[PDB]
Amino acid sequence: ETEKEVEFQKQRNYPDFKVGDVLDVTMVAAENERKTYVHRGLCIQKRDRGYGSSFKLYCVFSDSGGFIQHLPLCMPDILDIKIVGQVDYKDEEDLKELVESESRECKFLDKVL
């Protein structure tokens, strides 16, 4: 596991983000002929488990409602991650209530590129 983690770190350099931060993630869609898109959303869950690390990205749209994604951190499809803001919360219960009640999470209405 550590051998694979060393190789990955030489290829990518991501920031040390936390839960509650707003992120911009660049990904490649293998289904759509490997086209690049940029997603903006809130980080609601982060797991630090070595090579199996992952996080959850949350966003809300104008009419369709909430949308959640689970993304492995070491997946090659991800190209870049950046921190753009922060959303305050009190505890996990408060964060869960915010997710269920979609409001003030519409950073960008659609995906770029």
Partner 1 sequence: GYRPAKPVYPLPDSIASLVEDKIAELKKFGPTPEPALEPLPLTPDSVRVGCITVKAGMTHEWDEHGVMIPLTVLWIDECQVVGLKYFEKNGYYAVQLGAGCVKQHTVLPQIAGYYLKHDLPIKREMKEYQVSSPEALLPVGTHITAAHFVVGQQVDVTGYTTDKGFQGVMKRWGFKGMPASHGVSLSHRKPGATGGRQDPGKIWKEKKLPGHMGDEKRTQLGLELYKVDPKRNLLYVKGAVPGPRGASILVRDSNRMDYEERVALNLPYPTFIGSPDELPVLVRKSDKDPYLMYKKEIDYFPIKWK
Partner 2 sequence: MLPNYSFLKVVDNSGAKLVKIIGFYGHPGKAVGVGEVVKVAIKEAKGEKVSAGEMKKAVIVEQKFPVFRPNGSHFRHLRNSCVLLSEKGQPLGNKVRALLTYEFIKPRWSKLRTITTKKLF
Partner RNA sequence: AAUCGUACCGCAAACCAACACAGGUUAGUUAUUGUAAAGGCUGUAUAAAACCAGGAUAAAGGAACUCGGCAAAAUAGGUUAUGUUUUCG
Partner RNA sequence: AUAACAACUUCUUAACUGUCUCUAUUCUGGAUUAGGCGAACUUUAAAUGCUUGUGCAGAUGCAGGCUAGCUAACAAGGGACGAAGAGAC
Partner RNA sequence: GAUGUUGGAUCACCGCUUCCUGUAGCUGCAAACGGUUAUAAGGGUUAGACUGUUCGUCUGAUAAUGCGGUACGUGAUCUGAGUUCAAAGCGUCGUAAGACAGUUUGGUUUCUAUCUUUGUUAGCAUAAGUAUUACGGCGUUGUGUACAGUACGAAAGGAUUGUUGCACAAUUAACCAAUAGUUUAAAGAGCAACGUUAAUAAACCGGAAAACUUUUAACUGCACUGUGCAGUUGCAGGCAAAGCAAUGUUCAGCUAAAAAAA
Within residues 1-60, the interface with partner 2 by CB under 8 A covers 29-32, 35, 37
The answer to whether 71 contacts partner 2 (rule: CB under 8 A) is yes
Interacting residue with RNA among 16, 32, 33, 49 (CB under 7 A):
49
Query: How far apart (Å, rounded) are the C-alpha atoms in residues 40 and 81?
Result: 10
Those residues with Cβ within 8 angstroms of residue 93's Cβ, 6 or more apart along the chain or in another chain: none
How many residues bind to partner 1 according to rule CB under 8 A? 12
Token code pair at residue 100? 């269920």
Beta strands in 6-98 (DSSP E): 21-29, 35-47, 54-60, 66-72, 78-86
Nearest to 113 by CA among 62, 39, 19: 39
Of 1 and 88, which CB lies nearer to RNA in the complex structure?
1
Residue closer to RNA by CB (options 35, 47) is 47
- Shortest Å distance, C-beta 70 to RNA: 6
Q: Least Å distance between CB 104 and partner 2?
A: 16
